[PDB]
Design a protein around this ligand. Sequence first.
Ligand SMILES: *[C@@H](C)[C@H]1/C(=C/c2[nH]c(/C=C3N=C(/C=C4\NC(=O)C(CC)=C4C)C(C)=C\3CCC(=O)O)c(CCC(=O)O)c2C)NC(=O)[C@@H]1C
Ligand SMILES: *[C@@H](C)[C@H]1/C(=C/c2[nH]c(/C=C3N=C(/C=C4\NC(=O)C(CC)=C4C)C(C)=C\3CCC(=O)O)c(CCC(=O)O)c2C)NC(=O)[C@@H]1C
Ligand SMILES: *[C@@H](C)[C@H]1/C(=C/c2[nH]c(/C=C3N=C(/C=C4\NC(=O)C(CC)=C4C)C(C)=C\3CCC(=O)O)c(CCC(=O)O)c2C)NC(=O)[C@@H]1C
Ligand SMILES: *[C@H](C)[C@H]1/C(=C/c2[nH]c(/C=C3N=C(/C=C4\NC(=O)C(CC)=C4C)C(C)=C\3CCC(=O)O)c(CCC(=O)O)c2C)NC(=O)[C@@H]1C
Ligand SMILES: *[C@H](C)[C@H]1/C(=C/c2[nH]c(/C=C3N=C(/C=C4\NC(=O)C(CC)=C4C)C(C)=C\3CCC(=O)O)c(CCC(=O)O)c2C)NC(=O)[C@@H]1C
Ligand SMILES: *[C@H](C)[C@H]1/C(=C/c2[nH]c(/C=C3N=C(/C=C4\NC(=O)C(CC)=C4C)C(C)=C\3CCC(=O)O)c(CCC(=O)O)c2C)NC(=O)[C@@H]1C
Ligand SMILES: *[C@H](C)[C@H]1/C(=C/c2[nH]c(/C=C3N=C(/C=C4\NC(=O)C(CC)=C4C)C(C)=C\3CCC(=O)O)c(CCC(=O)O)c2C)NC(=O)[C@@H]1C
Ligand SMILES: *[C@H](C)[C@H]1/C(=C/c2[nH]c(/C=C3N=C(/C=C4\NC(=O)C(CC)=C4C)C(C)=C\3CCC(=O)O)c(CCC(=O)O)c2C)NC(=O)[C@@H]1C
Ligand SMILES: *[C@H](C)[C@H]1/C(=C/c2[nH]c(/C=C3N=C(/C=C4\NC(=O)C(CC)=C4C)C(C)=C\3CCC(=O)O)c(CCC(=O)O)c2C)NC(=O)[C@@H]1C
Ligand SMILES: *[C@H](C)[C@H]1/C(=C/c2[nH]c(/C=C3N=C(/C=C4\NC(=O)C(CC)=C4C)C(C)=C\3CCC(=O)O)c(CCC(=O)O)c2C)NC(=O)[C@@H]1C
Lengths: 57, 160, 160, 160, 160, 67, 36, 100, 36, 161, 161, 161, 161
Amino acid sequence: QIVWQNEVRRFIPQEKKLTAGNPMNFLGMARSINPAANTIPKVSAQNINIEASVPRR
Amino acid sequence: SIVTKSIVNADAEARYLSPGELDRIKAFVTGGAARLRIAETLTGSRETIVKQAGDRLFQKRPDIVSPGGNAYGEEMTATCLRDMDYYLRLVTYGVVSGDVTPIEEIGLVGVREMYRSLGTPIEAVAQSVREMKEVASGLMSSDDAAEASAYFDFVIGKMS
Amino acid sequence: SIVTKSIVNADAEARYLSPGELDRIKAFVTGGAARLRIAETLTGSRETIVKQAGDRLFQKRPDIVSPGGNAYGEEMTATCLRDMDYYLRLVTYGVVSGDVTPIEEIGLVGVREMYRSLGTPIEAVAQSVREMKEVASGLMSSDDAAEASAYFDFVIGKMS
Amino acid sequence: SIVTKSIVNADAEARYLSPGELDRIKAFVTGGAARLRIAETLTGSRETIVKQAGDRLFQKRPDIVSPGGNAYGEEMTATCLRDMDYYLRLVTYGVVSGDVTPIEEIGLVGVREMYRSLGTPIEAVAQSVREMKEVASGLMSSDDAAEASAYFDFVIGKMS
Amino acid sequence: SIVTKSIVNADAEARYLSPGELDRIKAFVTGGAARLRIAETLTGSRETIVKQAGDRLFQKRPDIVSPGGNAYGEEMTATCLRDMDYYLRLVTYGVVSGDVTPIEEIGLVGVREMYRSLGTPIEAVAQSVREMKEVASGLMSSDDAAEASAYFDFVIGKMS
Amino acid sequence: MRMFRITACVPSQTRIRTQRELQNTYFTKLVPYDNWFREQQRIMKMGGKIVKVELATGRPGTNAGLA
Amino acid sequence: ALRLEIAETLTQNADLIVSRAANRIFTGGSPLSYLE
Amino acid sequence: QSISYLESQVRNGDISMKEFVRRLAKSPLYRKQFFEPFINSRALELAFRHILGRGPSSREEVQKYFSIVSSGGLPALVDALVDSQEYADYFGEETVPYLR
Amino acid sequence: PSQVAFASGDPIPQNVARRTPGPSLNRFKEMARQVK
Amino acid sequence: MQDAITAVINSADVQGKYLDGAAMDKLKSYFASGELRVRAASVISANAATIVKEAVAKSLLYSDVTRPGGNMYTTRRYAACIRDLDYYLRYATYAMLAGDASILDERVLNGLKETYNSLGVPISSTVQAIQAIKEVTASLVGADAGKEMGVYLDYICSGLS
Amino acid sequence: MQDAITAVINSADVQGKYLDGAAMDKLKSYFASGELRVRAASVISANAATIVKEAVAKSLLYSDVTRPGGNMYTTRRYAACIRDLDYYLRYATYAMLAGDASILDERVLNGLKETYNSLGVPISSTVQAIQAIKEVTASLVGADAGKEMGVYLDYICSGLS
Amino acid sequence: MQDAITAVINSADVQGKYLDGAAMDKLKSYFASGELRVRAASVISANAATIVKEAVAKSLLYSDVTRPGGNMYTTRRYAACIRDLDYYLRYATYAMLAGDASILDERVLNGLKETYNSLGVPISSTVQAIQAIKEVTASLVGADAGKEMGVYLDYICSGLS
Amino acid sequence: MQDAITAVINSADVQGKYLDGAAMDKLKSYFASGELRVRAASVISANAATIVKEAVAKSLLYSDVTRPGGNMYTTRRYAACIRDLDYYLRYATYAMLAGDASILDERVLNGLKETYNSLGVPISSTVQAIQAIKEVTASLVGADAGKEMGVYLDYICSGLS
Ligand SMILES: *[C@@H](C)[C@H]1/C(=C/c2[nH]c(/C=C3N=C(/C=C4\NC(=O)C(CC)=C4C)C(C)=C\3CCC(=O)O)c(CCC(=O)O)c2C)NC(=O)[C@@H]1C
Ligand SMILES: *[C@@H](C)[C@H]1/C(=C/c2[nH]c(/C=C3N=C(/C=C4\NC(=O)C(CC)=C4C)C(C)=C\3CCC(=O)O)c(CCC(=O)O)c2C)NC(=O)[C@@H]1C
Ligand SMILES: *[C@@H](C)[C@H]1/C(=C/c2[nH]c(/C=C3N=C(/C=C4\NC(=O)C(CC)=C4C)C(C)=C\3CCC(=O)O)c(CCC(=O)O)c2C)NC(=O)[C@@H]1C
Ligand SMILES: *[C@H](C)[C@H]1/C(=C/c2[nH]c(/C=C3N=C(/C=C4\NC(=O)C(CC)=C4C)C(C)=C\3CCC(=O)O)c(CCC(=O)O)c2C)NC(=O)[C@@H]1C
Ligand SMILES: *[C@H](C)[C@H]1/C(=C/c2[nH]c(/C=C3N=C(/C=C4\NC(=O)C(CC)=C4C)C(C)=C\3CCC(=O)O)c(CCC(=O)O)c2C)NC(=O)[C@@H]1C
Ligand SMILES: *[C@H](C)[C@H]1/C(=C/c2[nH]c(/C=C3N=C(/C=C4\NC(=O)C(CC)=C4C)C(C)=C\3CCC(=O)O)c(CCC(=O)O)c2C)NC(=O)[C@@H]1C
Ligand SMILES: *[C@H](C)[C@H]1/C(=C/c2[nH]c(/C=C3N=C(/C=C4\NC(=O)C(CC)=C4C)C(C)=C\3CCC(=O)O)c(CCC(=O)O)c2C)NC(=O)[C@@H]1C
Ligand SMILES: *[C@H](C)[C@H]1/C(=C/c2[nH]c(/C=C3N=C(/C=C4\NC(=O)C(CC)=C4C)C(C)=C\3CCC(=O)O)c(CCC(=O)O)c2C)NC(=O)[C@@H]1C
Ligand SMILES: *[C@H](C)[C@H]1/C(=C/c2[nH]c(/C=C3N=C(/C=C4\NC(=O)C(CC)=C4C)C(C)=C\3CCC(=O)O)c(CCC(=O)O)c2C)NC(=O)[C@@H]1C
Ligand SMILES: *[C@H](C)[C@H]1/C(=C/c2[nH]c(/C=C3N=C(/C=C4\NC(=O)C(CC)=C4C)C(C)=C\3CCC(=O)O)c(CCC(=O)O)c2C)NC(=O)[C@@H]1C
């Protein structure tokens, strides 16, 4: 049995429909794999000594 | 538009446009705010008119969604509502143009052969555009309803 | 007329009138009161306009009344003023009808053959009806002169 | 493909196909079934390689999804996975064609200028493609993955 | 009528009948006995075609006999099965003539605007002639019913 | 648009030389006013006879409202 | 098929037909001396 | 796409095929399909094969018909094409034009 | 049924002969005959 | 053709006189009735096919003309008949917008009587069909616009008869 | 145009000789296939709307060509594509019953490339449409008649490509 | 051809979306400039001949081209040059009224360069003549609409070059 | 240019999707047909000069083309015609290997008709030469390879015509 009331209620515009190359197809995929961002590494350049902390090998 | 019609006719007669067409062009230019207002009203209510008119068509004529029908299937009904959105878009084009030439050049030439091929009933398509006309006229003000329903009955008259 | 040209376009394309041209006929009907007001003031001033324009014509071009011109003599100048009266009547006819079609189908096409067989200078009668449009624009209000000057300038263009 | 490359080379030397290139086309024709199997597995599992390699990329280079990064944001990570899917589809095309010229023409010429305009780290995209080849090598059989990793290798050589 | 099309085409080409066309008229005259045999079998079994097509139609598509359709009560169905008898008569005319030319002469063209003015579904009329076709193929021998179906399918193609 | 109801017979003067198909040289024609002068000149230069012509379209002597 | 076997008949004996026609027409010698 | 008015006038025969060709060529349908998408020169080159069934034959013929279509446009070009000695010689009054 | 395949079947090769010197070289043929 | 303003302009031009009140009263009447004519034409163009189908249902269906041997039996013949009927409706709409029936008695009634006499079309049945169209339009668009339509429609009836 | 019979007679006329050894074989193969080719023509001409229906439904519908921005978006363009597929099927029937592709050379392929490059019609999508045509005809008429149509349909495809 | 209205309609239609305000402002700007376009077109249609007259007097008269051996030497070629300038002025008026240069490359420019190259017409001299037309109509109409006219005149020159 | 494989890849890339089942079926068809194409290319590369030799002896020697006044009279004209036949045979071999006639459009048929029209080359005589090339090639190369070579050489003939 196929029913048309829910299809009429679920109708979406074709210009709002997603095509192949739209990155919004992978928007839910990026929701699925939530990337782990970095906590901000607070650094001050004034506390850095140029002569010593530069590598030497 | 009427500008395109007048320029095309004057070009075919190999003459400049007379003031008897120039006053018509400037009158169409000045009387544009009402057509623009009807256009943004229709594109604001572009979804709900399509939803209600599709609901009214499939409750009035269940042979469309009957087994063995042309639109039996969820994707078939989705494409039917997409065609309703197409013709509503063409009605907005004709409203904002002030002329029937966009509807004629986009979605009226070859429609009979097209739906004769696809098997879709042309009188039911005319009923769909008529139901969009009734929903839009109920949704908007009466003079604007008559102005939009003018292009709507042009579409259903070219349909049938 | 503009109504008969609209229905000529309508049965040339072999269908009913478009809603745009129906609203255009509505605009013509609503403006026809103003065109008829222009008709009243022009037919009230039908004598003084043509007399002042004829005096301006003879003042601009004295070679018409000089020997060697076409209009030498009292009956010749009377017929010249009669031609100017007919052309003023034709401009009022066009203002009433809303288009240059009555001027074209009465006294504007074939005017080259007319004044070639008469020997009359076509640039001189174009200058005469140009003085008619200047005196008319002097006597009219600004919107009425702007309305009549397009039809007058069409007479200038097709009779130059 | 390899057929087009051999035809272009033979046209460049204005000669018919050498029997070595005829043998290479013959061997590609006989061995294309394994390439079709590889491409079928990749297009069957094409979300899984992008999923795992995107996870491994966001683990190994979290500066990419750190604030101030090129792919910081939900839509930006979506476009990241979109680019990964593009390169996976290109690798399937190259596996089918047996020569890497479709990959070079579609997504390796001007890639440096494109990602330089976009501000995207080209070595990080190379890391993502390398992780895609790691996931594909885990997913496929040994000889098939060893043959299919060489197109990934050409992508790595062009981008890094 | 094959001989009608012979005379029309020979007059358009403006010469006498070619020997191949004369052999065509020989073939048509020899097959005339078989086609009139099919004709008298159809007019012997005409009524069972009408009744079985009618009630098979009313069981397959019950929308029209339902309220909202065109078939109300007894007289609408009587006019419909009269139309079914008319189209069966036209099929027998085409069979006995050897071509669909008298079908187009009495009824095969204009049917779309006919049933659009009448509100009648043209695709349902096509389906009506469809069960006319396989009921005739059931009752009459199929190797000899290929000739009758060769006009039946043209009729349903024109009304499709 | 004012027109004419004409009826004429124009025999072909070159059909014998050209060996073409035949047409009925007699015809009843509806011809517009603007084209009727050129059409009549074509008939008389071809050598045909116009045996009937009436102003079936429009009123005679209309000064305005022609097309 | 009938036209084909007629052609197969006539092409086989074409030399015979033209020889009989030439012997019917020409006198004073052998017309078949220099057949091309 | 058709003009049933002109088809009915052909069907009762008050106008013949010559007036049908004239009115159909100056109709807005032919004006849209073969006069709007072209220059006047290419338009008259197509109008020759649409009306006379042949191409333009000489430089002076192209010159004359270009002067006609410049003076009066598509209706003047169509009228000059149908009201010619060649059209009346080849297709008469009732014969459809054909590609020669 | 399978005798539909005229074009789609195996093609029948024609016997097409090489073009020979014609009667415009009759003088050179006579010249070559006297050369022998 | 000749509408109301060109008709009064031609009546003035025959006498060679400017437009006076004796024609400007009819001109004001035309400009007063113009929006009524345009709205009635809009309604008729909206319901143009329905007027034809109700007219043939109330006047032409189930008659001897649509019986076999009649003058409306075959499908091409019925298509031609409804083509004539909405031709009459559309040209009556043209004359109703124009204000005069020059278009009706010229580009419809040039040889219509003679061609119907040659074909055998029943003039009385076509008059009944036009009266059915007039009744449908009068019941559909109103009283004043209905009788304005009826003037041109029984002008068509007088032209046919 | 020319057919297989005209090609045979022209080749034998260029040779100056009769139909000696292989012309007869080609002619008898042509006449042996001819009645079944006429039957296939009858089936295709009877069902011709269904082949283009299943071809457009199989290959071109629900695609970028039919969605906005595509070359089959408007209804005029869709009806023109339907008429083009009807042209391809009908001229393939012509070439299949003539036994030679000279009709395709002189009335189809003479200007098809230039009209499609000027119009902007997608060559690959047209090729896919003709491939859908040839599998639908192979399903609806048979394998042998499907191949006999499909060699000329692939000739049209090669003319496209 | 396309005016500004049909241009923005097809620009919305090729992407398949409805009218948004970033498209509706284009129609609002066109309706703002429409009365300026109508008045400029009326002025140019009234003074069409004298624009060409003083343009040829400004640019082409007493030059090499009217002398014996020049391209506009004989009166036939002079009348053809005046006819060409009338064509350019009328179609530029059409493009100015439409607000879109579609009729220029759709009815003037698509082959005119090849025609002038075949005829030997000096394209640079015609460009200078059109520039003279631009200066004359800019002095005659005004700067605001003369700029819009000159845009399409330079469009004609760029298509000619 | 493109082969069948790159045609499938480009069509799938234009669609923006991966290779579906029908694409895999077309690829499998080309991989099935590849071996015959390779051996046909080997045969034609073996007999490249000899096919041209017997084709020109089959069609063009001792004719009006090689007689004085014909377009193959002089030695440079004969060398240019042999050069053209070598070009056609090599590019037909390339198209046979690729399974696509796109290289004939890109390299051969893009301007060769205008080239021959400017040169005065009889395209009827070249068409008969390529028909002789078809016959001699199909004599040496087999049956299905003969069909493929005949299709591509008839494409060259259709581009010429
Ligand atoms: C029943 C399954 C279907 C159907 C039929 C239906 N038809 C009518 C009415 C008419 N049909 C015709 C058509 C013809 N008359 C002819 O002589 C010919 C050619 C031989 C044709 C094609 C006509 C003229 C009528 C009008 C009645 C009359 O003959 O005078 C009706 C009645 C509709 C009404 O409003 O009375 C019906 C119900 N309708 C369906 O839905 C089914 C597809
Ligand atoms: C309700 C409207 C009816 C219904 C509709 C229906 N339509 C289709 C299929 C198509 N319709 C179109 C039409 C257009 N596309 C355009 O761009 C325009 C002009 C703006 C038109 C008119 C098209 C293109 C299709 C094909 C779908 C595609 O995009 O490729 C179907 C599907 C039929 C099928 O066999 O797939 C249906 C069901 N059917 C009804 O019965 C209602 C009356
Ligand atoms: C489906 C087939 C594809 C499609 C086609 C498409 N075709 C046209 C229009 C034309 N096609 C032709 C071709 C021919 N005319 C002939 O007489 C013959 C031989 C008998 C052929 C092959 C021509 C001339 C036209 C233009 C005018 C006409 O309609 O005949 C169009 C319309 C182009 C437009 O923009 O109007 C289209 C869209 N398009 C696709 O995408 C499918 C792949
Ligand atoms: C011959 C028995 C006697 C006769 C004949 C005659 N006829 C003409 C002139 C013409 N006759 C026709 C005939 C037809 N018109 C049609 O529509 C048809 C059917 C297709 C036919 C047969 C025509 C067209 C002409 C005009 C010439 C033309 O070719 O267009 C003449 C010539 C009259 C003259 O002076 O030119 C003659 C002599 N008269 C006799 O005396 C014969 C006994
Ligand atoms: C002038 C002395 C008097 C007169 C003239 C007049 N004529 C017309 C219109 C037409 N006259 C003709 C007749 C001809 N056809 C030909 O081929 C020739 C040359 C042999 C002639 C003389 C035609 C066809 C017309 C119609 C014009 C056309 O077809 O384009 C008119 C105009 C009538 C009107 O405008 O309704 C006039 C006035 N009448 C007079 O009063 C002068 C005394
Ligand atoms: C229908 C009301 C009645 C009917 C009529 C009937 N009409 C035809 C066909 C024709 N109709 C016309 C009418 C016009 N053609 C025009 O161009 C115009 C001006 C707009 C009109 C008014 C004509 C000329 C015909 C002749 C042939 C044609 O189809 O054009 C027919 C067919 C005659 C035939 O069979 O040949 C009939 C029967 N008959 C009735 O019973 C209805 C009451
Ligand atoms: C003298 C009888 C009358 C007259 C003359 C006059 N002519 C011009 C200017 C031009 N006249 C021509 C015409 C021709 N060029 C040709 O090659 C031929 C045929 C061989 C002709 C007939 C041209 C081209 C010019 C422009 C000058 C140029 O060479 O470019 C003028 C000057 C008008 C101006 O505005 O410059 C005059 C005054 N004037 C009269 O009053 C006499 C009746
Ligand atoms: C004038 C500015 C310069 C110039 C003009 C010149 N033009 C012609 C003749 C032709 N002009 C056209 C051009 C058009 N055809 C079109 O369809 C359109 C737009 C709708 C245009 C603009 C054509 C086709 C011709 C040829 C027609 C004919 O020859 O009659 C000529 C005459 C050339 C001749 O050999 O007679 C000239 C001289 N040349 C100049 O030097 C001026 C600078
Ligand atoms: C004789 C000294 C040697 C010889 C000759 C030979 N030639 C051919 C065939 C051809 N030769 C030419 C060459 C020319 N044609 C010209 O018009 C000119 C310049 C005026 C030249 C140099 C051509 C075109 C042919 C083809 C025949 C034709 O005219 O169509 C042959 C025949 C080879 C064949 O396969 O038929 C021969 C035998 N061969 C020798 O061994 C002698 C040393
Ligand atoms: C041989 C089948 C017939 C024929 C040939 C012929 N051709 C020429 C001269 C040229 N042909 C070309 C064509 C090409 N351009 C390309 O890019 C390619 C490959 C894709 C080809 C095939 C060109 C450019 C020339 C000009 C070369 C040149 O300038 O010499 C000639 C020579 C004519 C001459 O030298 O005047 C000939 C004879 N003509 C025939 O009669 C043969 C039947």
